[PDB]
Amino acid sequence: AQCEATVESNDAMQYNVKEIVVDKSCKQFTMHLKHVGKMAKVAMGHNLVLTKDADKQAVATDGMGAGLAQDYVKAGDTRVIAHTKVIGGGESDSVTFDVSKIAAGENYAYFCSFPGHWAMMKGTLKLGS
Numbered sequence: 001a002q003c004e005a006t007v008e009s010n011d012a013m014q015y016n017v018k019e020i021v022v023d024k025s026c027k028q029f030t031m032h033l034k035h036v037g038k039m040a041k042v043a044m045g046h047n048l049v050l051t052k053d054a055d056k057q058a059v060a061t062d063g064m065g066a067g068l069a070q071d072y073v074k075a076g077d078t079r080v081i082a083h084t085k086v087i088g089g090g091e092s093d094s095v096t097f098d099v100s101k102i103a104a105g106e107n108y109a110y111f112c113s114f115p116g117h118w119a120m121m122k123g124t125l126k127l128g129s
């Protein structure tokens with residue numbers, strides 16, 4: 001596997017990749033998000049938020065309450081391993097995190113915390129083996 005991944009998000013509330021594998025050789029990992037659509041953030045912004053799979057809904061719910069100016073992620077949320085900014089069509093963002101935060105054998109989710117999107121925009125991240 002690799003030490004970065006790129007995920008595209010679009011105007012139909014989809015990510016183009018459903019699984020990311022972090023190579024065991026990596027100390028850090030970078031997630032690149034592209035918004036390949038034409039909708040504005042007000043309507044159809046997207047981010048990428050990485051959590052333990054069990055924490056997805058709780059983080060998304062707290063994120064809605066945080067608002068767009070907080071990238072729809074609660075400030076200081078200890079359940080968030082990493083997140084990007086919310087972007088609109090024609091934009092991109094990236095975030096890097098320490099792979100020591102990812103444990104072998106655990107299930108992680110990456111998802112969009114823009115209101116309503118997590119039900120459609122979610123994949124799995126795991127540490128390779």
Ligand SMILES: [Cu+]
Binds near residue numbers: 112114
């Ligand atoms: Cu989204």
